[PDB]
Design an enzyme around this catalytic site. Sequence first.
Site, PDB file in Angstrom:
ATOM      1  CD1 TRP B 130      -2.899   1.370   0.537  1.00 38.61           C
ATOM      2  CD2 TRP B 130      -2.128   1.768   2.604  1.00 38.61           C
ATOM      3  NE1 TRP B 130      -3.698   2.344   1.106  1.00 38.61           N
ATOM      4  CE2 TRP B 130      -3.247   2.595   2.376  1.00 38.61           C
ATOM      5  CE3 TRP B 130      -1.473   1.833   3.843  1.00 38.61           C
ATOM      6  CZ2 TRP B 130      -3.723   3.500   3.342  1.00 38.61           C
ATOM      7  CZ3 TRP B 130      -1.950   2.722   4.800  1.00 38.61           C
ATOM      8  CH2 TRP B 130      -3.069   3.540   4.543  1.00 38.61           C
ATOM      9  CG  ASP B 211      -1.820  -2.592   7.475  1.00 36.47           C
ATOM     10  OD1 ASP B 211      -3.027  -2.841   7.657  1.00 36.47           O
ATOM     11  OD2 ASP B 211      -1.446  -1.606   6.816  1.00 36.47           O
ATOM     12  CE  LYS B 246     -10.156  -0.549   3.845  1.00 33.25           C
ATOM     13  NZ  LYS B 246     -10.246   0.607   2.951  1.00 33.25           N
TER      14      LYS B 246
HETATM   15  C1  LIG Z   1      -3.114  -2.555   3.840  1.00 36.55           C
HETATM   16  C2  LIG Z   1      -3.941  -1.368   4.288  1.00 36.55           C
HETATM   17  N1  LIG Z   1      -3.676  -0.746   5.460  1.00 36.55           N
HETATM   18  C3  LIG Z   1      -4.389   0.304   5.904  1.00 36.55           C
HETATM   19  C4  LIG Z   1      -5.455   0.845   5.187  1.00 36.55           C
HETATM   20  C5  LIG Z   1      -6.189   2.047   5.730  1.00 36.55           C
HETATM   21  O1  LIG Z   1      -7.372   1.694   6.441  1.00 36.55           O
HETATM   22  P1  LIG Z   1      -8.216   2.852   7.166  1.00 36.55           P
HETATM   23  O2  LIG Z   1      -7.216   3.863   7.690  1.00 36.55           O
HETATM   24  O3  LIG Z   1      -8.947   2.158   8.291  1.00 36.55           O
HETATM   25  O4  LIG Z   1      -9.127   3.461   6.138  1.00 36.55           O
HETATM   26  C6  LIG Z   1      -5.844   0.261   3.876  1.00 36.55           C
HETATM   27  C7  LIG Z   1      -6.988   0.827   3.045  1.00 36.55           C
HETATM   28  N2  LIG Z   1      -6.715   0.791   1.598  1.00 36.55           N
HETATM   29  C8  LIG Z   1      -7.336   1.352   0.623  1.00 36.55           C
HETATM   30  C9  LIG Z   1      -8.514   2.269   0.902  1.00 36.55           C
HETATM   31  C10 LIG Z   1      -8.196   3.709   0.520  1.00 36.55           C
HETATM   32  C11 LIG Z   1      -6.858   4.134   1.102  1.00 36.55           C
HETATM   33  O5  LIG Z   1      -6.800   4.564   2.283  1.00 36.55           O
HETATM   34  O6  LIG Z   1      -5.864   4.033   0.365  1.00 36.55           O
HETATM   35  C12 LIG Z   1      -6.861   1.124  -0.740  1.00 36.55           C
HETATM   36  O7  LIG Z   1      -5.749   0.580  -0.911  1.00 36.55           O
HETATM   37  O8  LIG Z   1      -7.568   1.440  -1.721  1.00 36.55           O
HETATM   38  C13 LIG Z   1      -5.050  -0.902   3.433  1.00 36.55           C
HETATM   39  O9  LIG Z   1      -5.307  -1.517   2.258  1.00 36.55           O
END
Ligand SMILES: Cc1ncc(COP(=O)(O)O)c(/C=N/C(CCC(=O)O)C(=O)O)c1O
Lengths: 396, 396
Positions: B130, B211, B246
């Site tokens: 990410w 994570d 999620k």
């Molecule tokens: C591995 C991982 N770790 C943390 C997060 C963030 O979660 P939240 O801070 O609870 O919204 C996410 C959320 N991911 C998104 C949602 C939008 C974003 O925050 O980037 C995405 O990759 O599209 C994740 O995939």
Amino acid sequence: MFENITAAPADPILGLADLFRADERPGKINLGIGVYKDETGKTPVLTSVKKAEQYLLENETTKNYLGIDGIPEFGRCTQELLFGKGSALINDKRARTAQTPGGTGALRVAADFLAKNTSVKRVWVSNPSWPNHKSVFNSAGLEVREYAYYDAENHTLDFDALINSLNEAQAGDVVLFHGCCHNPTGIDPTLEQWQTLAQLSVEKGWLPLFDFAYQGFARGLEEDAEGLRAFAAMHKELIVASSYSKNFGLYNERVGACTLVAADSETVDRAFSQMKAAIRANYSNPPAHGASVVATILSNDALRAIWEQELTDMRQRIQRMRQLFVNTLQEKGANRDFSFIIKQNGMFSFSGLTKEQVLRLREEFGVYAVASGRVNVAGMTPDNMAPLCEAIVAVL
Amino acid sequence: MFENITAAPADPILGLADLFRADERPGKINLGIGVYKDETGKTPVLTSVKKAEQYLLENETTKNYLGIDGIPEFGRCTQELLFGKGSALINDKRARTAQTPGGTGALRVAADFLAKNTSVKRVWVSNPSWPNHKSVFNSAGLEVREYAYYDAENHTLDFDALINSLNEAQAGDVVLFHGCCHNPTGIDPTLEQWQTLAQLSVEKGWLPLFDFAYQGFARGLEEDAEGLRAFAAMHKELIVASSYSKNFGLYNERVGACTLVAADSETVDRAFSQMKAAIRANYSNPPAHGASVVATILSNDALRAIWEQELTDMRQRIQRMRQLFVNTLQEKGANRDFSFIIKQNGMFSFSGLTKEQVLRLREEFGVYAVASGRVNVAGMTPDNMAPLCEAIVAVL
Ligand SMILES: Cc1ncc(COP(=O)(O)O)c(/C=N/C(CCC(=O)O)C(=O)O)c1O
Ligand SMILES: Cc1ncc(COP(=O)(O)O)c(/C=N/C(CCC(=O)O)C(=O)O)c1O
């Protein structure tokens, strides 16, 4: 990795909740943390807020992420509260607002933004102030210096000492001002003093940072923003960290705003993009429920009228407690002038008690205040006033 | 102060929302940001969540501040999800949990805690991961290094490359693991690979940071935590940053947790006091609404049953879309093997598209993916599948 970590020192304010509640005796009285209580000693949910929450329950169709800067309507309503409908700052699109988790969140976002994107190294904070100011700014890597503020003999704003203190501030330093209801003193600059300070900060090249957590609790919404607006009329740039915790009674929903002002639209937009980057790397985007409540209320004539009256009710009850406090102290004991407590703004009175008198109040009488001598007048009730004043008179 | 600030670069993920919605043509298809959609292309509020919100509306009597670490029941329920009812970590009181604003908030609190209270200087993150991981850790002053992860030829976990990469990690470095549903690859370690990694991290002196944003979306709640629990059985210390965004569909309410584990109760309590200090200086205390919803649901048999089935429904719909995607691609065009998409876990597929193919999809066809080639399978529906697959086949 963790076996050598030293315990953190106790928080001077929030740590009182720990000492309280751990206290098992029935007659205890909480005058510590700055939370409003009604005449029954409770901190209720505002009726305007309950109505807004019912509306959200019935009409929300998704919890999809907000933008990094939160709900657009919330930002527009915030800027109108701060600067006034029809303000030049709003017409010229010189201000950008990010919805944040509380006023504390807004202060930290401001600090991170400043540490990473400007030459700021130092923030000037009043002595005394809210103890968490130093913590927030230090955490971002900024040093904190103190300026003189309070004449304790006359219980006034020591304006000459304030000015001479700030002579040590250099161009490019941040100076933090409480917008209204100074925490802990309850003493605010007069309009003319605000106007002088606005002029001086321009000439000296200070970046004003306003902490605005109590709008509406001194005299009224528009009145309490006069100082900020005097600064806005004089400065190309400033930052406002504001909170809806107190004036909407939304403490635990974490509803605040960080408002960035620059000389023109192009500049504030460019600078705000880095504020959003600082948010993305902190908590990503802000919590919707509390801010949606605030936006729903501020943008609806019916709800806003209910809320404005509830805020007026809170302000007036605190004023009634200020008078009852002063009168009851004279009964039951001293023999000292407490009239200055009547003129102080906000929920606190800075009562002249020492650290040891406050400790004694807690240990002997179960009356809880902050070691600075700050007491929460909004925590006083007709029912707890007599034991409270008997206790204070006993410790002198 | 602000006239020389350079604009921040666009966010690789959240910036898609800006490009989308700005796009005025009717047939556009959003496969970008990781948000669940149902069969109608909407992101609804879960029914369990609506019921919990109605309960809170009817029964909440105050918005008084939570403790710095949030709602106690929320922490207990979180630890049971992570470690299992009856876990030794829970019985020995080796874990402390702070409620945070989202998983992102939990990652930042972990990072700040580590930067200020330990000798940690470096975090190892998978390549790919990410994109916001690097941003969060850098913001706390930690450097980020990458380890190998993905065999793109065979669409598997390149375990030998992963191990050889991590040989460069030194004792006292942090290694970040995705608990389940690797973002973006959808490829997770097997239980035996997790067990090997748990043993290796002990011998090498790495601090594991999990994570855990997708518990329940790979195989199930308990199944998805097997890797974490294998690590918990072997390590004295670790940190978990988890999210309910999620799996409760509570994205914008910012509901997450930072869980600190140490060798014993005395140590974790001492270390946690500094985690709370780091929170106090950031956003002070966390937002109640989303976490109260989660606590209300997890601690009630009726609501938890409704919620667990809703989570199962989401997982199964994504699996159905994985199969429909692979089948429809074969129709309408290629002539290439996409069977690996069926085995991937979570909401994403890492489809083999290049940066330019993704740009072309957006510009020519109004189909929106991330430049990495990551597509949100949870954004696919029976209704948008054919145009989607026609578009992909057109760009090869
Ligand atoms: C591995 C991982 N770790 C943390 C997060 C963030 O979660 P939240 O801070 O609870 O919204 C996410 C959320 N991911 C998104 C949602 C939008 C974003 O925050 O980037 C995405 O990759 O599209 C994740 O995939
Ligand atoms: C000048 C000033 N600035 C910011 C804040 C924090 O407001 P929120 O972060 O919205 O809860 C406050 C809240 N003060 C409290 C409430 C508890 C606390 O956070 O310390 C107090 O002094 O007791 C404040 O007085």
